[PDB]
Every structure is written in C-alpha cells, then in structure tokens.
Symmetry: C2
Subunit: 235 residues, 2 copies
C-alpha cells in the first residue's frame, strides 16, 4: 500500500478520527491485522491559530509545506491536510512538495456531486465560510454553491469551534445551536450540509441534522484510503 | 517544546491513547490552544506481527530503526516506541538513531519504584511475559521482579491481545478473564500489576483490577510529555 502523510493537530481532536478511519478502512479492505502505513506531522495548533488571527497566512504555508517535505523525506507518498481552514494555503504545500495532494474540498465536492446536489449549506470557521478559497474551489470545480449562516450565527459557530470543540468540550447547548442553524439553512433551500470544519462531526451526530451530512473529515479519510490502496478515483 | 517521534501502529488501537494523552498533557501544562509537536510513523502491523511469529526479529529491528531515522530527518528530537513487545529490538533502534530513546520499561520501572514495589504481576504478549528482554531490564535496572501467569493463562491472555484487542473487540468475557488472572496473581503476592501490552488498558479499567495498575501506555505518554517540556526526570 502507499504510505499517506497526514498534516494534523489542527486541532488534534479531529486528527484522531482521520487516524481511526484510515486504519479502519485498511482493516476492512485487507483483513487480518493489516493497518495503515501513516506518517503524521501534528503541529502545535496555538502557533497556527494565532497566525490565522494575525493574517500571517504565508507563515502557515511555510510551516505546513516544510512539514509536508519532512513527511515526504520519511517516505510519504501523498499528502492529506486535516483541516478545511488551512486549505487557504494549499498552494504553498503543493508548490513545494511534489507528492500528490489530496485536496479536502475535491473529496467533498466529489461526494456532493454523487449526491446530485448543487446548493448546500456550509458550516466551518469564519475563514472557510466567508472567504473565497474554499467556496470558490467548489464553484469553479464542481459548480456547487454554498449557503452560509447569518453573520451572528457565523460568529457563534466559529467561537464554538475554537473555544469548545478544539478544547474537547462538546456541549448540548452548542450541539442544539448547530442543529438550529442547519434547520434554518434547510428552510432557505439547502439540499445538504457540509461539516466544513473537521471538528464539527465530533459535536453534531448526523441524526441531529435535518439535512444530509457531508462530513469533510470522514470523506477525506475515505479518499486517503482509496489513494493508499489505488481504488476507485485513485485507481 | 521538543518534537516527539512516535513509532506506532502496534497496534494502532493503542497508538490513539498515546496521541490523546500527549496532546492532553501539553494542553494541561501550556494552556490555551497549545498542542503537542508529534511526528508519528504507524506501521502495517501485519508485517510486524507476522515477523514476531516467524522469529524474524532482526527484520523488525530494521523496519523500526529506519522508521526512527525517517522521523529524525523530519525533526523528531526523541523516540517513543508504542509497544512493549517490540522493545525486544530497542537495541537496533538506539544503535542506528542517535535521538534520545525513551525506553518504555524505564518509564514503567520509575513508576513502580516510586510506588515502593519490588514484586509485580506482568501481563503482556507471550514474548514480553516469557522472554528475558523486558523482565531482565526491570531486574537489572530497578531490582523489580515480575510474576507472570500460568502457561494456560498466558496463552489465553496472548490470544485475546491479538485476536480481540488489536482488532478493536473489548469483550466482558475477556475483561473478566483478565481480572480473574490479576486476582490470582494478587493471591500469589503481587503488589501491583503491569499492563505490559499497550492494548490491555483499553480492555481492563483500573476499577476492575484488584491490584494497583501500571498502565505502560499512560506512563510512557507522561514520560514523553516530560521529555518534550524538559520537566522532572527530563529537566
């Protein structure tokens, strides 16, 4: 199998699901005691998140591209970045590291396409929801349009990510708030909902969403498994 | 902080507790959104476990020493091997990789010493329980003696590790069996019990053991945190 290189700790709480799901996918397909060949670089998220707030995106591109290179030198054969937000600097990683880069939004857009949807709600950090880098790739590459929450809702969704989810706190008050925002975007005509921060699936079970759920972490892990075993779109 | 290099996937089920506990230790000590700088190499356990059964230990030394080198080249500053069994080949890793190697049995023996114990029960794979490499280090370095289960009990403990625990199956029948073996070794005068396979703590909660528990994975993770932050015995 090919060795996958994970760029994680953004936050580490959602890196665990990547590692669990990639190992479980390999076990399911190869059987026995087979497990995944993984190289992981986990950052100190404080530095990354501080750069987000200071607008020092180029510095984060440098940190993550050097990390990807480190994993390549240890034998990684492709790169998975365990965070939607930091695909804002995917270009720096892909420019520097010659490995196949499994873009999280491409895996998600393939899933939404297969569901036959073109108008979906998008929950994530405020960067992912408000800026161009994530939604613009979905529009340009898949002709998928995203509805995002109202400005007050977005502030609260974003505060819950950084002040609770990345700290391991999964409260019913926040769960209910997310579910209410999803229901409101369903009222606005959303066909599905993208859990477009990799921590969101730790808070909101699919049964709590009135919309079909595209969990970016789970879809990205399945993408990595297909790449490692050269299956389906990676054959 | 120093970047820790984890050699894991032996099995991946117990690598998750290392990653969770090391990140939680860093969060507890630095606060905020701080998380651990981790490099992880996760193997396909099938190859390793097959080598165990074939007696191809030198081959596993080669695999793990090359992995440690890969992590060193990516910036690791010390090595943690996430498995008691594979310390049978620690010498190959330490000979080839110049990084500090945080031997799992040293962290455990320091814990047992601090508890003032000299005679403890040892549960693990049959290699760890029956051979010289693990118990002989505890005797030579800490003057700690291990009691191990009777030969039939050892066969079953070992079968449960490989046929259930490494496959994510945690059954009450097996939990109860482990707890009964611990009670019997307590009858034989054991002062504490070493969970000396890193999966055992996933099956047996401490409240189920009649003996004080030395969970090698949890102690090794605390050891790694102290090394990363240059605390206590790593200051």
């Amino acid at each position: 199998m090919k060795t996958i290189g994970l760029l994680g700790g953004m936050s580490w709480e959602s890196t665990i699901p990547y590692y669990r799901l990639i190992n479980e996918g390999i076990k399911q397909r190869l059987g026995g005691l087979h497990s995944a060949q993984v190289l992981l670089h986990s950052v100190d998220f404080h530095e990354i998140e501080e750069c987000q707030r200071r607008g020092e995106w180029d510095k984060t591109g440098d940190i993550l591209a050097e990390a990807a290179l480190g994993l390549q030198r240890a034998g990684a054969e492709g790169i998975v970045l365990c965070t939607n937000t930091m695909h804002k600097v995917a270009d720096a990683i892909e420019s520097r590291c010659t490995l196949p880069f499994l873009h999280i939004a491409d895996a998600t857009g393939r899933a939404i396409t297969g569901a036959g949807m073109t108008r979906v709600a998008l929950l994530g950090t405020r960067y992912t929801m408000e800026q161009d880098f994530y939604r613009g790739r979905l529009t340009e590459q898949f002709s998928i349009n995203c509805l995002i929450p109202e400005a007050d809702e977005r502030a609260k969704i974003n505060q819950i990510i950084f002040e609770e989810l990345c700290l391991g706190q999964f409260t019913e008050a926040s769960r209910a708030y997310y579910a209410q925002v999803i229901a409101r975007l369903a009222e606005q005509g959303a066909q599905g909902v993208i859990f477009g921060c990799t921590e969101i699936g730790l808070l909101v079970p699919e049964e709590r969403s009135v919309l079909p759920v595209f969990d970016t972490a789970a879809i990205h892990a399945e993408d990595a498994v297909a790449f490692m075993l050269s299956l389906e779109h990676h054959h």
